[PDB]
């Protein structure tokens, strides 16, 4: 007669169970029929960090299926713009043509994909509606004003290294209005595309189309969008007297804060969230009996890091909206019968 | 609208309305698993399970077997609605939290 409703207990030789006991018929009384108000009451989002290119909200009180749906949407279904075709007029570089096209596909563009649309199948030409064109034209020459020196930038250098700065947007249609001068640009100005020696030249036109990270990774808008369940650490016994420090070393260092309540030293669990699961207490043989570390049941921690095309919060919003769009597409196709 | 990027339903042996297999095209484990989680909350369904037919293909099979009365197409169309309601609520809550944090940080 003992219920544990909220944690995923764990030892070393394996974890105890894979359930969450929050579904219909999963208890004598604790049965579920998807009370929507109970959800709307027990759900809360807490946004910890939000630099540019980072977010770490909490998303407390949701199941693993919905959290995983959100994570898989950001990685593979939120749309981005990226180079699909490369027209090479001349290329006397050491970097091949196919390898140059590949390298150009993996460069992130700062166009927002919500103002564009998908190219129809076999729309090779493209129009202001679905495409953005950029041009890289660079040639390397020796600089006339150079002494007998060997630094590659000083001599043998007008364009020794071709960067993303060298790529220039060719406004395709009326896109010069709508897009102000600096808005459509590659996100990073320092990505090394190639290297040149005097007499070598690159000249090409790149076409960027819309697409999702599912049919090619180049179109994916986040470095990673993973999540982790909130750890839980409980001191079953008061640790003290120089075993507190050994305890504080078997964890990521901020988790167990050793206070000094009396002349003796007491270890306390200051911040369970910092913990990385390393299970190094389980090697102690005397303190594996003192601490129980498990996971909180439906308390997640998310971390979204965008490449630079869209801000992270906008990414999460568009992910939730893409899931809603899936649901609505299937609802309206069902209503079609 | 789309004759086959979307739904194809196969009523079972005897065309039992209470046992249907929906084929959802262009879907992977994301919608499959979230929709199966949302359809399991209905006390009127006795068996819900999804599965991907083959890696090379892009389509899932849901199987809903409901109790004696309802035609097993209401559980599906209600799991869809509840999942979309949950997404709308999560979106509202997340945007409100982001706004509140932006204000708290821009003030200080």
């Amino acid at each position: 007669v003992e219920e544990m409703r909220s944690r995923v207990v764990l030892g070393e030789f394996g974890v105890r169970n894979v359930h969450t006991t929050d579904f219909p018929g999963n208890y004598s009384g604790y049965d579920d029929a998807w009370d929507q108000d109970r959800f709307e009451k027990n759900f809360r989002v807490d946004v910890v960090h939000m630099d540019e290119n980072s977010l770490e909200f909490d998303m407390v009180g949701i199941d693993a299926a919905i959290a995983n749906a959100f994570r898989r949407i950001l990685l593979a279904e939120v749309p981005t713009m990226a180079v699909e075709k490369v027209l090479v007029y001349n290329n006397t570089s050491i970097v091949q043509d196919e390898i140059l096209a590949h390298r150009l596909g993996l460069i992130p563009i700062h166009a927002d994909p919500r103002l564009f649309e998908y190219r129809n199948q076999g729309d090779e030409e493209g129009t202001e509606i679905d495409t953005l064109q950029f041009r890289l034209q660079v040639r390397c020459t020796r600089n006339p004003h150079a002494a007998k020196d060997s630094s590659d930038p000083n001599e043998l250098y007008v364009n020794h290294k071709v960067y993303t700065r060298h790529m220039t947007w060719i406004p395709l249609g009326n896109q010069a209005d709508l897009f102000p001068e600096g808005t459509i640009r590659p996100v990073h100005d320092d990505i090394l595309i190639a290297q040149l020696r005097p007499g070598q030249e690159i000249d090409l036109l790149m076409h960027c189309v819309k697409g999702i990270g599912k049919d090619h990774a180049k179109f994916s808008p986040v470095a990673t969008a993973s999540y982790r369940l909130l750890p839980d650490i409980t001191l079953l016994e008061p640790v003290e007297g120089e075993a507190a420090e050994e305890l504080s070393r078997c964890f990521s260092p901020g988790v167990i804060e050793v206070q000094e309540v009396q002349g003796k030293k007491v270890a306390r669990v200051a911040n369970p969230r910092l913990d990385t699961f390393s299970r190094e207490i389980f090697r102690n043989e005397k303190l594996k009996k003192v601490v129980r570390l498990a996971r909180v049941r439906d308390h997640y921690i998310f971390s979204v890091e965008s490449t630079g095309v869209l801000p992270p919060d906008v990414l999460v919003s568009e992910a939730i909206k893409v899931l809603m769009g899936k649901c609505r597409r299937f609802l309206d196709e069902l209503d079609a019968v | 609208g789309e004759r086959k990027t979307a739904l194809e339903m196969v009523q079972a042996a005897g065309t039992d309305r209470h046992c249907v297999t929906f084929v959802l095209h262009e879907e992977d484990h994301t919608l499959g698993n979230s929709l199966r989680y949302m359809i399991m909350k209905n006390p009127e369904v006795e068996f819900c399970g999804y599965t991907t037919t083959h890696p090379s293909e892009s389509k899932i099979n849901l199987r809903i077997q409901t109790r004696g009365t309802l035609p097993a197409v209401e559980p599906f169309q209600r799991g869809l609605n509840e999942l979309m309601n949950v997404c709308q609520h999560v979106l509202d809550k997340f945007e409100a939290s982001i706004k509140d944090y932006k204000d708290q940080k821009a003030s200080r």
Binding site: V48, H49 | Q104
Partner: peptide, 5 residues
């Protein structure tokens, strides 16, 4: 580290 203060 710790949701917003």
């Amino acid at each position: 580290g710790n949701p917003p203060v």
